[PDB]
Amino acid sequence: IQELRANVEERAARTASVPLDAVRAEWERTCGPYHKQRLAEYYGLYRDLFH
Amino acid sequence: DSSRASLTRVHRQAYARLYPVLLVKQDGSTIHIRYREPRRMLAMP
Amino acid sequence: YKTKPTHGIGKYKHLIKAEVRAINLGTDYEYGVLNIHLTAYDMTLAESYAQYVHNLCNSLSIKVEESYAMPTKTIEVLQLQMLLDSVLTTHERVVQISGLSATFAEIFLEIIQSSLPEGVRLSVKEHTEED
Amino acid sequence: SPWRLLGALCLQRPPVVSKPLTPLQEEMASLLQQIEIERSLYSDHELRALDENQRLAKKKADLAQDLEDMWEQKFLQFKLGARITEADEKNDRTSLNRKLDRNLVLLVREKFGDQDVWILPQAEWQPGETLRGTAERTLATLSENNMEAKFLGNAPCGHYTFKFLGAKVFFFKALLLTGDFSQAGNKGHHVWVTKDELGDYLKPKYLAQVRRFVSDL
Amino acid sequence: IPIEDFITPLKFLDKARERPQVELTFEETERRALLLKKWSLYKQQERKMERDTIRAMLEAQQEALEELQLESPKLHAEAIKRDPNLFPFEKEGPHYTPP
RNA sequence: AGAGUGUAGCUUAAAAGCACCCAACUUACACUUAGGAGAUUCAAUUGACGCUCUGA
Known part of the structure; x- marks a missing residue:
């Protein structure tokens, strides 16, 4: 975070795009299982698949 | 902590120019007063 | 309902108070609406000082009923020696304070004396005036 | 439980000259002045200078500088007071007019037969007397000067007890207004001290904590 | 009669046609933003120091x-x-030059 | 020398919520729109570097 803040220097925020592929990869390689379990619970998979 | 409220700004929109004026009263002391026109000295009798 | 155990659950008037002497008991003491007139020649300086005073009062949990400003006095002084005009003006702003208890007033006075701006005097007194 | 009755007072002094502006503060003030000059709406001097010059040029093709020079010469003739009145003296540690930007504090030196403590302007109050009255008497007698000490309230500021027979040093605050000292070259080695010199001189722990409630500024 | x-x-009202231009540059805006951030940080630090000093004074x-009430129950x-x-x-308040 | 301790101001959270202010709408305060500083003090359930109290 410190390196990113030093490289941006404030001037970039005064409108960056931020890629999405790396963000999706990181989300799938970390908290992906959490969102997957949440979606499964919302869709009603545990209450029907494994009872 | 005297320089805290010293730095100010005109919060209004319509206002004439204001220059730093050193007003000297009978007591003898310069005070940064914002008087009309760029007056450098205004001795108060 | 009344008989039901959920009585008085939607009561909100008892929480809102939708309705000055100087109490001086033995242990508790409270002044009577102290008025702090900020006499100065600059308008921005006086405004900033009043804003800082109000911010300090709000941070210290001090009540601020009124905070009006007094009119300007156009003091026309003729610089004699040669006639040279100099229409000066003296601005004044009042800040009412009531919440004070023992050393709180001393703390506030010390804070004021420590944070004084250039070209601004003081003159604290009671509220009994005629605007 | 014989508690030794002792008092004291932490003298102060209101500043006169303003404090210096930090380079960052100076840049902020310059930016504020620039934005104010940019947001201002016309001016009497500008209206009387620019329009007059334009009219004169138009008439020639068919005030301002004088007043500026007058103001410059008036400012040059008028000599202001010396703001830095500390470096010129340096060794004048016992002078009320030494420091003007920071707060000053009295400092008296007293030596006893049994101890030699760096005694701050202390006092001694009587059971039948009041602490405020004792402090006023000590300020009007020990200092030997006609001062207009403007107090704030009857409450204290800091207490420090010491046992061996208990005791208690009661301190207070007093703001001066016009201190007329008589005979400054007296035997009483009184010294005026602010903050850094206070922390550098005070050797004991009883007074080392007195600076915790003093306006650091 | 306030x-x-x-x-x-x-x-x-009428006199308002003397300085209608307000053009700046990117470097100027960046410098202004940096100065504003620095001044905000300095003001926050000063406010924290003032709060600490006030807390120390209140504790003292x-x-x-407390010491007065403990060693003198007739002077509180x-x-x-x-x-x-x-x-x-x-x-x-404090002026700029002495008399 | 002993006791209390150990996430910045606070937490029956384990790197989040309430605190803060600089600019615009304010006589002023408040709300709202724009940003930041912010911390498990280190070494392997334990040892020491920062404060309060009890003493000399």
């Missing part, structure tokens, strides 16, 4: 009051008693 002086005079006064009321010496409270 009549404040906050209404813009009528002279500031509380300790003094006199100490808390506010004296009538604050009605003509008048004091001038």
Whole structure:
């Protein structure tokens, strides 16, 4: 975070795009299982698949 | 902590120019007063 | 309902108070609406000082009923020696304070004396005036 | 439980000259002045200078500088007071007019037969007397000067007890207004001290904590 | 008859065609933003220092009051008693040069 | 020398919520729109570097 803040220097925020592929990869390689379990619970998979 | 409220700004929109004026009263002391026109000295009798 | 155990659950008037002497008991003491007139020649300086005073009062949990400003006095002084005009003006702003208890007033006075701006005097007194 | 009755007072002094502006503060003030000059709406001097010059040029093709020079010469003739009145003296540690930007504090030196403590302007109050009255008497007698000490309230500021027979040093605050000292070259080695010199001189722990409630500024 | 002086005079209506241009550059805006951030940080630090000093003063006064009440149960009321010496409270701020 | 301790101001959270202010709408305060500083003090359930109290 410190390196990113030093490289941006404030001037970039005064409108960056931020890629999405790396963000999706990181989300799938970390908290992906959490969102997957949440979606499964919302869709009603545990209450029907494994009872 | 005297320089805290010293730095100010005109919060209004319509206002004439204001220059730093050193007003000297009978007591003898310069005070940064914002008087009309760029007056450098205004001795108060 | 009344008989039901959920009585008085939607009561909100008892929480809102939708309705000055100087109490001086033995242990508790409270002044009577102290008025702090900020006499100065600059308008921005006086405004900033009043804003800082109000911010300090709000941070210290001090009540601020009124905070009006007094009119300007156009003091026309003729610089004699040669006639040279100099229409000066003296601005004044009042800040009412009531919440004070023992050393709180001393703390506030010390804070004021420590944070004084250039070209601004003081003159604290009671509220009994005629605007 | 014989508690030794002792008092004291932490003298102060209101500043006169303003404090210096930090380079960052100076840049902020310059930016504020620039934005104010940019947001201002016309001016009497500008209206009387620019329009007059334009009219004169138009008439020639068919005030301002004088007043500026007058103001410059008036400012040059008028000599202001010396703001830095500390470096010129340096060794004048016992002078009320030494420091003007920071707060000053009295400092008296007293030596006893049994101890030699760096005694701050202390006092001694009587059971039948009041602490405020004792402090006023000590300020009007020990200092030997006609001062207009403007107090704030009857409450204290800091207490420090010491046992061996208990005791208690009661301190207070007093703001001066016009201190007329008589005979400054007296035997009483009184010294005026602010903050850094206070922390550098005070050797004991009883007074080392007195600076915790003093306006650091 | 409270009549404040906050209404813009009528002279500031017609006279308003002398400085209508307000052009700046990217470097100037960046420098202004940096200066504003630095001043905000400095003001926050100063406010924190002032709050710490106020807390220290309050703690010292509380300790003094406690010591007074412990070693003098007949002077706490006199100490808390506010004296009538604050009605003509008048004091001038610090100037720039001495007399 | 002993006791209390150990996430910035606070937490029956384990790197989040309430605190803060600089600019615009304010006489002023508040709300709202724009940003930041912010911390498990280190070494392997334990040892020491920062404060309060009890003493000399």
